[PDB]
Amino acid sequence: DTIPVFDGHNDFLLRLLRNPANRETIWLKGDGTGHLDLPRMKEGGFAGGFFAIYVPSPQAHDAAHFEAMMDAPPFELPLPPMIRAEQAQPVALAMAGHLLWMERAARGRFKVCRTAAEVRSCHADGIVSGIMHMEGAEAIGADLDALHLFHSLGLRSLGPVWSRPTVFGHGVPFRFPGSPDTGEGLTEAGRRLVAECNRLKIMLDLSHLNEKGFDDVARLSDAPLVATHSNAHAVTPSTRNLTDRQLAMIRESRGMVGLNFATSFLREDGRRSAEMGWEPVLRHLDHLIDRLGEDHVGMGSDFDGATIPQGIADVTGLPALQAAMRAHGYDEPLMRKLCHENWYGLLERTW
Ligand SMILES: C[C@H](N)P(=O)(O)C[C@H](C)C(=O)O
Numbered sequence: 001d002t003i004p005v006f007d008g009h010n011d012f013l014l015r016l017l018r019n020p021a022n023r024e025t026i027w028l029k030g031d032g033t034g035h036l037d038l039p040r041m042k043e044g045g046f047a048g049g050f051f052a053i054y055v056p057s058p059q060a061h062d063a064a065h066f067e068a069m070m071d072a073p074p075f076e077l078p079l080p081p082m083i084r085a086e087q088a089q090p091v092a093l094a095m096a097g098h099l100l101w102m103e104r105a106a107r108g109r110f111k112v113c114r115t116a117a118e119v120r121s122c123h124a125d126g127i128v129s130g131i132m133h134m135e136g137a138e139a140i141g142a143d144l145d146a147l148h149l150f151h152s153l154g155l156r157s158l159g160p161v162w163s164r165p166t167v168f169g170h171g172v173p174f175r176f177p178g179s180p181d182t183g184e185g186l187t188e189a190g191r192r193l194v195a196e197c198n199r200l201k202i203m204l205d206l207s208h209l210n211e212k213g214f215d216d217v218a219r220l221s222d223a224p225l226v227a228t229h230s231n232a233h234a235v236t237p238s239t240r241n242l243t244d245r246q247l248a249m250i251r252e253s254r255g256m257v258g259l260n261f262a263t264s265f266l267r268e269d270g271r272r273s274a275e276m277g278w279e280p281v282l283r284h285l286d287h288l289i290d291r292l293g294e295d296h297v298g299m300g301s302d303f304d305g306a307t308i309p310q311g312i313a314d315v316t317g318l319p320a321l322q323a324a325m326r327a328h329g330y331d332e333p334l335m336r337k338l339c340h341e342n343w344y345g346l347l348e349r350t351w
């Protein structure tokens with residue numbers, strides 16, 4: 001009785017970036033590490049999701065010193081320097097190239113989808129779906145020319161920033177505890193980026209964007225507001241989470257929030273440790289569902305991007321998560337909404 005899950009955010013492509021020579025095994029067989037691969041997706045009931053193209057900084061997000069800091073709050077991680085298009089583009093092309101390769105290699109068992117109809121068809125057919133997503137828009141120059149290029153080759157979702165400055169605006173540093181109001185809003189280029197994404201029907205992702213940038217998108221975007229992998233600030237006051245005020249704005253826009261499985265954003269203590277139970281997961285889900293409404297919450301795992309609860313552990317833990325959700329009292333129609341229907345509706349409202 002596992003309900004298929006369509007997911008808001010994963011960083012599986014980073015694993016292919018880091019070991020391209022072994023990609024056939026990593027994707028088609030698994031290599032015994034990480035959260036995702038094709039066989040485990042099938043075992044865990046992963047229907048598909050957003051596959052993030054994210055350009056790492058020289059001190060990557062999982063550098064030892066950062067992990068150690070996040071283990072013992074309070075903490076504040078420094079923002080990395082801006083990466084410009086000339087440097088970001090080859091990396092983004094590499095990751096986009098791996099995503100297309102995944103589809104070639106899987107011989108029809110995985111499909112990069114460009115429309116909501118394709119996603120729904122994949123769901124019905126049991127074919128794993130993928131949405132090409134860019135987490136941080138460094139590969140897009142301020143001129144926006146590359147936005148059209150990436151769109152042409154399948155890009156359908158874009159977060160203007162990661163937790164790092166871009167020509168478009170500013171992301172939050174990783175900090176606990178702290179407000180998401182950590183810096184300046186969108187630049188003029190960022191405002192143009194919002195307008196152009198609206199015109200091209202590219203979904204904008206607010207995860208990582210600071211509060212001023214969030215307010216700018218809320219004011220400027222003609223489309224529902226979406227945070228693909230962010231939780232409730234009122235429960236866990238991480239800079240990465242959403243305040244009730246932000247949630248209310250997302251609700252008004254008929255938007256969507258994906259629950260991030262990152263330990264740091266779920267635990268009330270904001271620690272990185274996987275040693276936790278189901279309570280914090282359900283605490284965030286209840287809070288999100290209560291304020292956003294049952295139609296505006298889903299999963300945003302952050303599989304392969306963060307440490308997640310021991311009870312989930314990897315994609316094969318989705319059934320255990322569903323069991324906890326059911327035990328907590330979520331009925332079947334709500335379960336279907338949270339697992340995939342809400343994302344599919346959001347895609348239709350956006351695209
Ligand atoms: C580094 C990854 N791409 P991430 O998806 O940015 C994981 C992180 C904990 C977050 O999402 O804030």
Ligand SMILES: [Zn+2]
Nearest residue numbers: 011052054305
């Ligand atoms: Zn990511």
Ligand SMILES: [Zn+2]
Nearest residue numbers: 135207208229
């Ligand atoms: Zn992220």
